[PDB]
Design a binder for this molecule. Structure first.
Ligand SMILES: [Ca+2]
Lengths: 81, 70
DNA sequence: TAATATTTGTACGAACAATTT
DNA sequence: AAAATTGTTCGTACAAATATT
């Protein structure tokens, strides 16, 4: 269960939840916590662990895929590029 | 097959506009409300299409302003 | 000058399809 | 044959920024 800094975008440090989830996952990648063609946790596991909606998980992942450090296979899972 | 998902088709149409020069750079495309009434699809679908095209460098957006040809 | 309306942004939920396990 | 997992598509409610009255 990873924690959100969530509250008060009104001043400075606040990021949207999808951006925070994004930072975590990406930090997992280059820190080598998961290597290329290794599977990351399912959208459902991510939902529970970050305490956010599937929509928010899919946005975070959708972005990282488009950056090209993840790739997805429908029905298979999502993997470090 | 010739089938493409709805967001891909909205994507195609908008793109064609751009490269046929029906909207030039720094020029505005229809709003999301207009795009959805014209394609008869959801705001979500419209936002998905536009998001992809921003991500590929074809468009930029300004919250509260609108969306524009890059 | 200040309210209001308009428009894009983030974030929750729902149901079903398509593909893989 | 079923179950699990990602894909598409609809919906609702506010927040935040800009553009209009
Ligand atoms: Ca406006």
């Amino acid at each position: 269960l990873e924690v959100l800094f969530q509250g008060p975008l009104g001043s400075e440090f606040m990021l949207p939840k999808y951006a925070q989830v994004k930072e975590e996952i990406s930090s997992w990648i280059n820190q080598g916590k998961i290597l290329p063609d290794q599977k990351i946790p399912t959208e459902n596991e991510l939902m529970q662990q970050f305490g956010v909606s599937r929509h928010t998980i899919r946005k975070a992942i959708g972005d990282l895929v488009s950056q090209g450090l993840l790739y997805s296979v429908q029905g298979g899972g999502t993997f470090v590029a």
